[PDB]
Design a protein around this ligand. Sequence first.
Ligand code: UUL
Length: 347
Amino acid sequence: MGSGVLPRPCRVLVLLNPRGGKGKALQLFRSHVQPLLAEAEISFTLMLTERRNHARELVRSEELGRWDALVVMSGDGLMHEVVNGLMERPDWETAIQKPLCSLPAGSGNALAASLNHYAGYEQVTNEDLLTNCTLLLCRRLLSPMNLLSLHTASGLRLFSVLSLAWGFIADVDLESEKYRMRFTLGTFLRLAALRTYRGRLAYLPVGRVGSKTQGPVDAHLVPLEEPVPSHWTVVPDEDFVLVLALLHSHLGSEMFAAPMGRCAAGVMHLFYVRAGVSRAMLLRLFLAMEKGRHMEYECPYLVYVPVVAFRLEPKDGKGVFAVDGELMVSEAVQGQVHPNYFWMVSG
Ligand SMILES: Oc1ccc(Nc2nc(-c3ccc(Cl)cc3)cs2)cc1
């Protein structure tokens, strides 16, 4: 199952956002993570990272040869910054090979949840999740993971380790400003005055061909001013409640969003919900997501397709998106998956 190993013994850089877990991330490290590292012969150094772009800048400038792995203790948002930091480096090709480890603290631990799931553990939460992911780090097994490369109409190129979400899910990620979960509460009250979002979706299903038409090159993508290649699927409906590109099984620690198996190399999940669902059905799909049972409804407004690339354009000025949980505003976004691009600890 594992495709690599950390050395025993090893030393490990821990980037921690102390404002995580309602400001208890460091305490949680001390109580839950530290004692397990001692037993596993894993040395570490803690570097605190709270301000915007801080962890990005550290990782961009780091000498990576002193570390066997970078462990990231916060949420999906920190991993995001770390991965972009590495990819922004002139030596990205080798820098992106540094094993990464996700230890869940805050909220938005979809990555950590997915890995916990891949390893065969129960869908545990909070401190139990933190303990399980630490145990993965202690066991030292490594797996390669897909990376999402994204382009935006303004010309920004960035990377996504987990998800790009638009519409309902994006609106709720933003509408949330809480500790506690805030997603259920946010979903519930956005459900009240449900809205649809007008946009154009195109994607490239795992049925791609023998040929195709500063980081890696996005060979599947053409400029946003050009139409998508003719072998893509353009979605006919232009009214959505949500679109979701997801690289892993979980959208959140208790959201088993992708129960059809784990993604193959270079493949990501694409979900969209067409305009026309009832509030009740949306909520039912939401709550079934906890046990990964939502696909069992065979709801005709919910579409799943495995893809390697997509394009999404609203359609009424700018749209709000969530990239690995962080806010992003754009006129249009497209992306493609790069296969097995970085390594992570997981059993
Ligand atoms: O981060 C968030 C995750 C889910 C939600 N809310 C909802 N998600 C869904 C949903 C339904 C089906 C799938 Cl495959 C994924 C999400 C319905 S309501 C909001 C924010």
